[PDB]
Design a protein around this ligand. Sequence first.
Ligand SMILES: *[C@@H]1O[C@H](CO)[C@@H](O[C@@H]2O[C@H](CO)[C@@H](O[C@@H]3O[C@H](CO)[C@@H](O)[C@H](O)[C@@H]3O)[C@H](O)[C@H]2NC(C)=O)[C@H](O)[C@H]1NC(C)=O
Ligand SMILES: *[C@@H]1O[C@H](CO)[C@@H](O[C@@H]2O[C@H](CO)[C@@H](O[C@@H]3O[C@H](CO)[C@@H](O)[C@H](O)[C@@H]3O)[C@H](O)[C@H]2NC(C)=O)[C@H](O)[C@H]1NC(C)=O
Lengths: 52, 53, 48
Amino acid sequence: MCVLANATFPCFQPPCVPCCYENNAEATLRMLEDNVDRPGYYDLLQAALTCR
Amino acid sequence: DMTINTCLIEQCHVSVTDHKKWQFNSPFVPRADEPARKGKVHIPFPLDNITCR
Amino acid sequence: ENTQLSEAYVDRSDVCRHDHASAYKAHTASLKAKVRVMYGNVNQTVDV
Ligand SMILES: *[C@@H]1O[C@H](CO)[C@@H](O[C@@H]2O[C@H](CO)[C@@H](O[C@@H]3O[C@H](CO)[C@@H](O)[C@H](O)[C@@H]3O)[C@H](O)[C@H]2NC(C)=O)[C@H](O)[C@H]1NC(C)=O
Ligand SMILES: *[C@@H]1O[C@H](CO)[C@@H](O[C@@H]2O[C@H](CO)[C@@H](O[C@@H]3O[C@H](CO)[C@@H](O)[C@H](O)[C@@H]3O)[C@H](O)[C@H]2NC(C)=O)[C@H](O)[C@H]1NC(C)=O
């Protein structure tokens, strides 16, 4: 559902796993800033900001 | 660091760009670009039912 | 040589689904009742 340029990947599994924010903070923020109208926004947000 | 060797202070500017971090949509700070980006964060403490004596 | 864009609009509040008033048109009332009937050796209450 969620889209990254020309990716169109399911929002539960982003292509940045793992540590999306640790690897690239700015890219992750730009990733989130253009799916605000996408109903899968909050699960995308959960996926982008979690890692051990 | 950078040096100009040419002019005085009252000609150049420091405008830190920083980025990396969402701040807020506050009417007291400007936007950086027109159509805007916008995000979403859930605020805590929802409203609920109880009983008073 | 600068310019400001001022923008504002209005929305339904965050808790409108908990605290709101409803405007209705009312017509054609219908009444129920609950009647207790006894005779002989029968008590007992019905809803009609
Ligand atoms: C505090 O308690 C009150 C009373 O129970 C809550 O109001 C109730 O809120 C629920 C929402 O979960 C309403 O359910 C709704 O029902 C309609 C069908 O009538 C349905 O289409 C909706 O999708 C929704 O499920 C419920 O109607 C409503 N009660 C009344 C009497 O209207 C309130 O939400 C509770 N919480 C607070 C105030 O924070
Ligand atoms: C037909 O049925 C109704 C309900 O079963 C009868 O009324 C009931 O009568 C009894 C006896 O008087 C009531 O019990 C007493 O009530 C008082 C109230 O303070 C309480 O202090 C006593 O300790 C005892 O519980 C009962 O409340 C009452 N129920 C109702 C709903 O009124 C009625 O007498 C019956 N009619 C005939 C002709 O048998």
